[PDB]
Amino acid sequence: EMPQPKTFGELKNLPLLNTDKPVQALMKIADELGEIFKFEAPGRVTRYLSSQRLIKEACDESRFDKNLSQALKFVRDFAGDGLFTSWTHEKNWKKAHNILLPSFSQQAMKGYHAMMVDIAVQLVQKWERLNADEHIEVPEDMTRLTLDTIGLCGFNYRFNSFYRDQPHPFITSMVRALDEAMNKLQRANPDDPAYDENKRQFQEDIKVMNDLVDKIIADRKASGEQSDDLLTHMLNGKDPETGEPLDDENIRYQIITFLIAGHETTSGLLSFALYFLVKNPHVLQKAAEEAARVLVDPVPSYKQVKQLKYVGMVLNEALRLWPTAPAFSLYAKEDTVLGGEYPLEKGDELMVLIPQLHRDKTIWGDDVEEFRPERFENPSAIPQHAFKPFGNGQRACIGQQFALHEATLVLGMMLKHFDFEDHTNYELDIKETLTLKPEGFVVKAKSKKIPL
Amino acid sequence: EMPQPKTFGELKNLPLLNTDKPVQALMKIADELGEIFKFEAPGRVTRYLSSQRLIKEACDESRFDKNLSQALKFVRDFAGDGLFTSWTHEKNWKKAHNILLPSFSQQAMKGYHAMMVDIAVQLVQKWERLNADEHIEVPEDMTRLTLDTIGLCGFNYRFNSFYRDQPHPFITSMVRALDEAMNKLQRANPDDPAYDENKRQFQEDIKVMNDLVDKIIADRKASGEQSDDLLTHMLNGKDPETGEPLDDENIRYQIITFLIAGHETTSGLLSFALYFLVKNPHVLQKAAEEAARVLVDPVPSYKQVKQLKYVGMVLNEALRLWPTAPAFSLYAKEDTVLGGEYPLEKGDELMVLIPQLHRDKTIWGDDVEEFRPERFENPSAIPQHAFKPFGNGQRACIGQQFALHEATLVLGMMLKHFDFEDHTNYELDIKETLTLKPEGFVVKAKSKKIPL
Amino acid sequence: PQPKTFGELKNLPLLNTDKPVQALMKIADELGEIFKFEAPGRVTRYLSSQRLIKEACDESRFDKNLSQALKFVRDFAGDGLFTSWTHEKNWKKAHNILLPSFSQQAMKGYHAMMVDIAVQLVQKWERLNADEHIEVPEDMTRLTLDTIGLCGFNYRFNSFYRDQPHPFITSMVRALDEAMNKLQRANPDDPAYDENKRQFQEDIKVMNDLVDKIIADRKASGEQSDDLLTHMLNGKDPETGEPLDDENIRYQIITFLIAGHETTSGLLSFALYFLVKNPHVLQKAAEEAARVLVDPVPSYKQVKQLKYVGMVLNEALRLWPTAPAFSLYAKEDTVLGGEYPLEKGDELMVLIPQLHRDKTIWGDDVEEFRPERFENPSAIPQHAFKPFGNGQRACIGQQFALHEATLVLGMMLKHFDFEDHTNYELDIKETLTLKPEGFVVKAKSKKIP
Amino acid sequence: MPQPKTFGELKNLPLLNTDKPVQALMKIADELGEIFKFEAPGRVTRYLSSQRLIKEACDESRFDKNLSQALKFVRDFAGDGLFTSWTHEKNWKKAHNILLPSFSQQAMKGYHAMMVDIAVQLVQKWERLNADEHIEVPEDMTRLTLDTIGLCGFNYRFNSFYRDQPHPFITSMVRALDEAMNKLQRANPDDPAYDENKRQFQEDIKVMNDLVDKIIADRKASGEQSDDLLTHMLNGKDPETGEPLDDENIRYQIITFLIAGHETTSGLLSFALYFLVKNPHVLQKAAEEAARVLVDPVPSYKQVKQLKYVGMVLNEALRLWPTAPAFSLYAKEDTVLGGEYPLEKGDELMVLIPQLHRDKTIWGDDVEEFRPERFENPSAIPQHAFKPFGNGQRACIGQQFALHEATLVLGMMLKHFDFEDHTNYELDIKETLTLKPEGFVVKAKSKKIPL
Ligand code: MNH
Ligand code: MNH
Ligand code: MNH
Ligand code: MNH
Numbered sequence A, B: 001e002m003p004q005p006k007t008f009g010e011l012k013n014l015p016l017l018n019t020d021k022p023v024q025a026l027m028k029i030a031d032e033l034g035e036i037f038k039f040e041a042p043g044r045v046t047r048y049l050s051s052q053r054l055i056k057e058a059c060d061e062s063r064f065d066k067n068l069s070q071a072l073k074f075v076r077d078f079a080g081d082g083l084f085t086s087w088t089h090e091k092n093w094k095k096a097h098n099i100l101l102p103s104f105s106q107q108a109m110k111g112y113h114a115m116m117v118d119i120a121v122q123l124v125q126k127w128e129r130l131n132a133d134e135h136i137e138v139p140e141d142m143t144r145l146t147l148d149t150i151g152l153c154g155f156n157y158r159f160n161s162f163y164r165d166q167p168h169p170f171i172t173s174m175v176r177a178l179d180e181a182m183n184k185l186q187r188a189n190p191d192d193p194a195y196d197e198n199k200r201q202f203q204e205d206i207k208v209m210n211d212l213v214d215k216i217i218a219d220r221k222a223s224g225e226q227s228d229d230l231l232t233h234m235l236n237g238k239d240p241e242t243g244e245p246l247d248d249e250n251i252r253y254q255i256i257t258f259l260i261a262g263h264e265t266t267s268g269l270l271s272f273a274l275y276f277l278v279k280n281p282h283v284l285q286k287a288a289e290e291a292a293r294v295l296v297d298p299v300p301s302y303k304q305v306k307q308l309k310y311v312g313m314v315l316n317e318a319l320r321l322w323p324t325a326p327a328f329s330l331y332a333k334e335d336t337v338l339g340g341e342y343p344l345e346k347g348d349e350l351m352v353l354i355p356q357l358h359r360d361k362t363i364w365g366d367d368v369e370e371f372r373p374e375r376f377e378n379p380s381a382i383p384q385h386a387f388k389p390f391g392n393g394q395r396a397c398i399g400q401q402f403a404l405h406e407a408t409l410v411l412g413m414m415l416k417h418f419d420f421e422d423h424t425n426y427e428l429d430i431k432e433t434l435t436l437k438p439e440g441f442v443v444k445a446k447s448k449k450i451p452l
Numbered sequence C: 001p002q003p004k005t006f007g008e009l010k011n012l013p014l015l016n017t018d019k020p021v022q023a024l025m026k027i028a029d030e031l032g033e034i035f036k037f038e039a040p041g042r043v044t045r046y047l048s049s050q051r052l053i054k055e056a057c058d059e060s061r062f063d064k065n066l067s068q069a070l071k072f073v074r075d076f077a078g079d080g081l082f083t084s085w086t087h088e089k090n091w092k093k094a095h096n097i098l099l100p101s102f103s104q105q106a107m108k109g110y111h112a113m114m115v116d117i118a119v120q121l122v123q124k125w126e127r128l129n130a131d132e133h134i135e136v137p138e139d140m141t142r143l144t145l146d147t148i149g150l151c152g153f154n155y156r157f158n159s160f161y162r163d164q165p166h167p168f169i170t171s172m173v174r175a176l177d178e179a180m181n182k183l184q185r186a187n188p189d190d191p192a193y194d195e196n197k198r199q200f201q202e203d204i205k206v207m208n209d210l211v212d213k214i215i216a217d218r219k220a221s222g223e224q225s226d227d228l229l230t231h232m233l234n235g236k237d238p239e240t241g242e243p244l245d246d247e248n249i250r251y252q253i254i255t256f257l258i259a260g261h262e263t264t265s266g267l268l269s270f271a272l273y274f275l276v277k278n279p280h281v282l283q284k285a286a287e288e289a290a291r292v293l294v295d296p297v298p299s300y301k302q303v304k305q306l307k308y309v310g311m312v313l314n315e316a317l318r319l320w321p322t323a324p325a326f327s328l329y330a331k332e333d334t335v336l337g338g339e340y341p342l343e344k345g346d347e348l349m350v351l352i353p354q355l356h357r358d359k360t361i362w363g364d365d366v367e368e369f370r371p372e373r374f375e376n377p378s379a380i381p382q383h384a385f386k387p388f389g390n391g392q393r394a395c396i397g398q399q400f401a402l403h404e405a406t407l408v409l410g411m412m413l414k415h416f417d418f419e420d421h422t423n424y425e426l427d428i429k430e431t432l433t434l435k436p437e438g439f440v441v442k443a444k445s446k447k448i449p
Numbered sequence D: 001m002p003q004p005k006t007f008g009e010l011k012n013l014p015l016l017n018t019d020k021p022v023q024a025l026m027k028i029a030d031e032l033g034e035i036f037k038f039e040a041p042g043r044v045t046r047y048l049s050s051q052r053l054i055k056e057a058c059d060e061s062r063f064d065k066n067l068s069q070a071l072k073f074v075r076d077f078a079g080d081g082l083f084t085s086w087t088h089e090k091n092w093k094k095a096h097n098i099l100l101p102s103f104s105q106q107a108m109k110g111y112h113a114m115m116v117d118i119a120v121q122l123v124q125k126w127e128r129l130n131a132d133e134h135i136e137v138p139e140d141m142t143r144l145t146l147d148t149i150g151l152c153g154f155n156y157r158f159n160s161f162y163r164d165q166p167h168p169f170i171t172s173m174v175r176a177l178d179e180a181m182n183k184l185q186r187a188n189p190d191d192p193a194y195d196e197n198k199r200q201f202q203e204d205i206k207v208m209n210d211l212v213d214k215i216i217a218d219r220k221a222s223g224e225q226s227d228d229l230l231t232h233m234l235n236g237k238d239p240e241t242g243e244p245l246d247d248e249n250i251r252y253q254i255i256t257f258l259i260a261g262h263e264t265t266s267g268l269l270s271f272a273l274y275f276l277v278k279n280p281h282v283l284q285k286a287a288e289e290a291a292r293v294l295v296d297p298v299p300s301y302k303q304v305k306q307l308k309y310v311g312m313v314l315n316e317a318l319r320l321w322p323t324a325p326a327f328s329l330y331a332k333e334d335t336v337l338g339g340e341y342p343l344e345k346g347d348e349l350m351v352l353i354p355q356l357h358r359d360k361t362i363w364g365d366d367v368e369e370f371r372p373e374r375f376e377n378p379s380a381i382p383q384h385a386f387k388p389f390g391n392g393q394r395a396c397i398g399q400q401f402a403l404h405e406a407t408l409v410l411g412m413m414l415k416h417f418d419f420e421d422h423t424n425y426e427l428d429i430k431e432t433l434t435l436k437p438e439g440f441v442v443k444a445k446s447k448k449i450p451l
Helices: A022-033 A052-058 A070-079 A091-104 A106-128 A138-155 A169-186 A193-222 A230-236 A248-279 A281-294 A302-307 A310-321 A354-358 A373-377 A400-417 B014-018 B022-033 B052-059 B070-075 B091-100 B106-128 B138-155 B169-185 B195-222 B230-235 B248-279 B281-294 B302-307 B310-321 B354-358 B373-377 B400-417 C020-031 C050-056 C068-073 C089-102 C104-126 C136-153 C167-184 C191-219 C228-234 C246-277 C279-292 C300-305 C308-319 C352-356 C398-415 D021-032 D051-058 D069-078 D090-099 D105-127 D137-154 D168-184 D196-221 D229-234 D247-278 D280-293 D301-306 D308-320 D353-358 D399-416
Strands: A036-040 A045-049 A064-067 A327-332 A349-353 A418-421 A430-432 A436-438 A442-447 B036-041 B044-049 B064-066 B327-332 B336-338 B342-344 B349-353 B418-421 B430-432 B436-438 B442-447 C034-039 C042-047 C062-064 C325-330 C334-336 C340-342 C347-351 C428-430 C434-436 D035-040 D043-048 D063-065 D326-331 D335-337 D341-343 D348-352 D417-420 D429-431 D435-437 D441-446
Touching: A022 A036, A022 A169, A022 A349, A022 A354, A022 A430, A045 A052, A052 A349, A064 A349, A070 A169, A070 A193, A070 A248, A091 A106, A091 A230, A091 A248, A106 A138, A106 A302, A106 A400, A106 A442, A138 A169, A138 A193, A138 A230, A138 A248, A138 A400, A138 A436, A169 A193, A169 A248, A193 A230, A193 A248, A230 A248, A248 A281, A248 A310, A248 A400, A248 A418, A248 A436, A281 A310, A281 A400, A302 A400, A310 A354, A310 A373, A310 A400, A349 A354, A400 A418, B014 B022, B014 B169, B022 B036, B022 B044, B022 B349, B022 B354, B022 B430, B044 B052, B052 B064, B052 B336, B052 B349, B070 B169, B091 B230, B091 B248, B106 B138, B106 B302, B106 B400, B106 B418, B138 B169, B138 B230, B138 B248, B138 B400, B138 B436, B169 B195, B169 B248, B195 B230, B195 B248, B230 B248, B248 B281, B248 B310, B248 B400, B248 B418, B248 B436, B281 B310, B281 B373, B281 B400, B302 B400, B310 B354, B310 B373, B310 B400, B349 B354, B400 B418, C020 C034, C020 C042, C020 C167, C020 C347, C020 C352, C020 C428, C042 C050, C050 C334, C050 C347, C068 C167, C089 C104, C089 C228, C089 C246, C089 C398, C104 C136, C104 C300, C104 C398, C136 C167, C136 C228, C136 C246, C136 C398, C136 C434, C167 C191, C167 C246, C191 C228, C191 C246, C228 C246, C246 C279, C246 C308, C246 C398, C246 C434, C279 C308, C279 C398, C300 C398, C308 C352, C308 C398, C347 C352, D021 D035, D021 D348, D021 D353, D021 D429, D043 D051, D051 D063, D051 D335, D051 D348, D069 D168, D069 D196, D069 D247, D090 D229, D090 D247, D105 D137, D105 D301, D105 D399, D105 D441, D137 D168, D137 D196, D137 D229, D137 D247, D137 D399, D137 D435, D168 D196, D168 D247, D196 D229, D196 D247, D229 D247, D247 D280, D247 D308, D247 D399, D247 D417, D247 D435, D280 D308, D280 D399, D301 D399, D308 D353, D308 D399, D348 D353, D399 D417
Parallel strands: A045 A349, B044 B349, C042 C347, D043 D348
Antiparallel strands: A036 A045, A064 A327, A327 A349, A418 A442, A430 A436, B036 B044, B064 B327, B327 B349, B336 B342, B418 B442, B430 B436, C034 C042, C062 C325, C325 C347, C334 C340, C428 C434, D035 D043, D063 D326, D326 D348, D335 D341, D417 D441, D429 D435
């Protein structure tokens, strides 16, 4: 027995998620019913933890294990058995994990950084070419940056998203697919032909995505191959344990997975970091100073971008306030007892609200809402289990260091070359396409005319 | 004692079966473990056999009988009392064997061949009517051909599967059900919330298959009948021993088993044979000559298939390297010692790795991986029980001559009417749905301008 | 004479239905021979009476006018023969180039590829289960689209190998549906229509892309096929002395693809409907196909010899045309009908379906269908039967559409009987062209070659 | 006086009805001869095809610039800009004396640094292509040329490479030019057959004018310490009048320069590259010269001026296919032209540049072969023989502006790429008042040289 929102007859607790912002509404519900409230759609039942005292127990890997949320299962139609959408028990998870983790080591990050240059630059000089009347769309440009970055770094493919003014075809099809997956949780009945058009769209969109994967495999095969991208490790790499590589199906699924998960979250992070820095003009200066004093060169090396640090505080704080991956699901291997008086049968599903967890007064204090980059000056103070926006344990985000290195590079370059002034009095708008992203975020940045 | 693979505690070997390719994992395991290796899962034990000298004893009709594999047991729900899934100490198996065996014969093959041509003509016309730029998905189009062949010949129903862009609903549902069979074997815990979703799906898919069979009986019921056919021999066919016709409820099961087992195996065989013919030019040239000399008339005759010698040799060699039916299971009918080294209590289950059996270097020479049809120039020279791709004894594929007849006829016409080009130097990737088929195998086939 | 006016939006709200042309039919039966359909920013007059229509088509003072629908179609059809004025340079030029391709001898040239596609359709209907029923409009679009692809551009769409509609058809119906939806929109600058534009552009690219595919397929092949494409690429108009530039030819490929599949599929669908509804009428068509064509595959001469089916097709066009209307404008200022002055540039809309239902010229039983009514074509006065347009602007692919209809229909009727088990109630789906919706029939073969 | 076939009451206007008026007139010039008379309803024009007869046409004493019918239709949006201005117009002398000096070869050095930036974008877009992709040469050259002229002269960045489709200005301008050319081939414009064009046409002007609004607002708002064509216009007091230009004429000049200064130049680059790829030895010589002369990552002005053979190839491409298809003049009083042809006052005189180079009397025979060796020494070419940039004071003011970037950009390309004519392109030419090869595509594999 647990508090739960009102039950609508045979439809149960499902129809409360009937809005464009389902994840954002679950926070408002959690503040009411408490740290956990049971949620019950037809058949499926979940529980949403909002306080660390219980989330820490859910995160013990011997007790509980990552579960695919009702949304991630719908994602499986194009993501397949990739790292994000594969069960930990499917041999593909551990196989691909051990195969692809070497690509995110410290030594491979140095090789990726020079490729990150191309696209961070490729954003900076785009903004240097803009005239005084034009405002710049931060989410739309951050998505371009991040997608180009993951393409060129991990798959040696240039999306050239800055050379198109409207989103890349892959981006439109992907947002359609994620929007559809979020809308499928909605549908009391997805079986009715009333959504048949959606199905026709899904395959269609997937086509585009799949087609792009073809372009990434077709070129490298015929390409002059002198690079060790993530793609070479997918095609030619072998698993230490299995002893055998990935099958074609899972290779394509991993390519799709990394495109989506490598650009969406990171672009949302850059957009939120800006929103809070542009909203608070008094946080910029130090950071700016930092870049200017930390970057002796206009184009930096991995030692220089590793030497900059305060950007880490600024950026980490955006995820603490608004993580671009809002939640993850877990399940119970055995009939353990959670948080004291909570007992769970085998396979009971558990969701955790990363934003609401991070929005806990006991650990972070009463002033949770405040955007404070101060908190992260020390890594040691916060308990490990309280704050984690990249997942938990072995199922934590595999490309965390990649994401953060890219984000600091881009954000610090922005603050180094430009002066940002909020000229739109933006009201907060958080679009949910399986992920959290500021919607309509528009700012303009007067250049600092700093040469290369 | 008996070697065995790595057991993770309670679940023992069972967690190994999760991979997309279980049979290939077992082949890898057999390469290291040896002739035979034990394989114990919670609640089930089976010993996998890879050396021919053990296979010859396991195959003896007076030594070991057929046992239902763990996956075949789950297959029963749609297939059931059909011979492939029926027991040997089963009533319906004996009745159906005695009365459906006469439906396969020289006279029978003659009955089916004229109608086979039609479907093969649909295939040839589709590939002839493709534009120059287009390419052919061999396994997909082979399943397309095989369904229509078996349907039109043995059930007087045209699936019209060639007129469909996507796979037939029967194909989708059948593949998905086989998915659950395999994936629930590999499953540790039988009950869990999540599986219910799966469970739902598998009620759905099955129904489609059921629904489809309802047409064959209904269609023939309404339309004209009394034209010697498998479906006739099921409706009006009578048991010589008991003077009894088949149970209608059991006739439908027969239809399921035949539809399923008549395409997947033959289509996988055709795809594999075309693949191996593509990797070696000379082995094609010889067969392209054979098809021309043996088949002069535009439509192949019932005699002209038997006149083709090299086509059958190519098919048998391709079936040797990758037998489309990967394994069969057998239980001991009385207490025996296998090989004189391993004692087995009666009823113990042994699985047989057919592809690993064909790779035994002692019998097939020390170049087993080499694909040369010439091995089957004198098929009499092959040792006894060394080559059993279709099965063993009474329990082995009543329509194996139909398998060979359709596959030889089709492949003869394919090599006659077309020129095959490989644009990707395809990386061999084997997708397993309890049956082996190449995945991603695409070639182009230029026209040779031959009539009808 | 004018229908009801709503605000400054004039009578535009009256066309805000699924089937605008049907509403117009009601309105001229209500308001008489002619009526002015005023709209915000565009004014035209709909004409339904043979007495005025026959006068309207004389090219002395009349020239073809692009209707609003054709103006919107110009975004993808462009400068092609269908969406260009007679004054426009590419109409005269490319029409002189492509007109030799529609000669009866050239028609013989098309006959063979047409027979390939027709036998493909007859096959799909010969592989029919007893359970299966055919969707006539959906399969007929396949027949006509593959026919034009193969015969005019030597490109096999393989539409019959697709139970789902071809990507070209999906994108094209979205674009044409948008052309129809842009008429009823009160204001086009609304931001809520921005999405509608994207898919529209999306819909266009598909079409364009497929067009480009054809040009690639032709470039690398044995160059031995005489069709529309070889003519457009290399042909030269004697007076102009020049071939078509690269940008025009793409518009011509799009133009012909659309105009060859949609209107023709409509004709054969409606003709099958009418044959189904009247058993005797249909008996004669099957019987004439049997007597006149003995060969397994029709000969060109045998297609031309068929005349009952020609009556059936012309009479189906009479009751229901597939091109619903054509628009003309006054070359110079003139007066029509004696009671109406018309300044230069005032445009008229000749409504083909009501024109065919003029009681004076065709008798009172205009609603009643009978191919026997076309037993003497010269007996019928001039411009009584104008479903193909006026003068030079009349359909350049008249004989191609008629040859396909006659040939294919003869094959269908000779090969088996047709049975409307569904007793389908005629619902005409309007997408710039008149096409029935949901018309499904079962035809059990006569087992002949 | 030789005339082509008068089809009917419409004089011989149906002769230009084909979309390629210049190509048809060029065939007609081969057949009819050195001069032929072409008359439309209400106007008569003379098309000259011979250098000896054009020689008298060149003299300013008897002939001065007259706006052609096409240019007169262009004037609607172009206004009294330098291109569509009369010589006997108060704004021509003003804007000429004020803007003639801005194209100085010494003023070119200030342009160079911004002129290489847009070329950096071109080379980058090509370098950053994936192997499966190809370059639309004219479509990308138009982006380069538009950004080049806009940035160098008006300090405005169109960012044409950042838009996958052509710029809004480009589409509206192409429709305006196509419209002005279309109005040429009309017996009577009054009828409402293409009165619809009149809304569309006017619509286009808005866009262009509206875009020009932005170019006035970005210069005033932000600080503008930039010397350029627009800065010269903004202040720009004429010495003769003693008075600056008014904003009636300022916007007209901005529009005039944008259109006339990217269209023709992108056409030139495309033509020259097509010729280079069709002729491998000429290419190889020019590409190796580009390697020798350009030793810096960012080229230097002196290096662009040093390239003689790149300019020679550009001049040969211009000679064969001049981007400006024709220029027209008017006569002073009565004079005898050629000795066989007399003319009254104000008689129209339109020079057909492409056919001028085709006549044997100068370049000898083999006029159609692309041989960039005809410009070895500039002096041996007869003076008055080669006039692709106009005549006299009505010669192109941008001759200095066009060639520099043309030598620069082209040079840069030859330095960083190897070009392959995979399509084996069959030549097709489009003339929206300016000649450019339509649909010409190549693949460009990089030389991996840094910038
Ligand atoms: C912003 C940055 C960012 C955030 C907030 C982020 C958040 C997450 C969260 C939360 C999870 C756990 C999901 C779950 O249901 O348990 C997760 C898993 C994952 N993430 Mn990421 N992630 C990236 C950047 C981020 N990830 C980037 C960049 C990549 C690609 C290079 C990436 C690739 C993954 C993959 C792959 C997984 C799945 C890992 C696994 O299951 O083994 N990521
Ligand atoms: C390639 C072609 C092909 C292969 C490799 C093939 C493989 C097999 C194998 C192996 C067995 C025995 C399984 C076991 O556990 O002992 C078997 C039995 C069977 N097969 Mn088939 N089989 C076909 C073609 C093949 N079969 C075709 C074609 C049909 C139908 C027309 C068919 C119908 C059967 C039936 C029915 C059985 C059951 C025989 C029995 O149990 O009495 N088939
Ligand atoms: C049913 C068959 C059928 C009908 C009713 C039909 C109706 C018309 C009508 C009506 C017009 C012109 C009326 C106007 O003034 O705008 C017209 C013009 C045209 N049609 Mn067709 N048309 C076809 C079949 C038909 N067309 C077929 C088939 C093709 C292609 C092969 C085709 C290609 C055209 C073209 C092209 C034009 C424009 C030619 C021109 O006006 O110069 N077609
Ligand atoms: C190669 C490229 C190129 C060619 C072949 C070219 C050709 C011409 C020709 C011919 C004329 C004369 C037209 C006539 O009717 O008299 C002319 C006039 C002109 N052109 Mn430019 N021109 C440019 C590049 C060219 N122009 C560029 C670049 C600019 C702008 C920077 C430019 C700006 C003009 C202007 C302005 C005029 C009008 C000068 C005048 O008559 O006052 N130009």
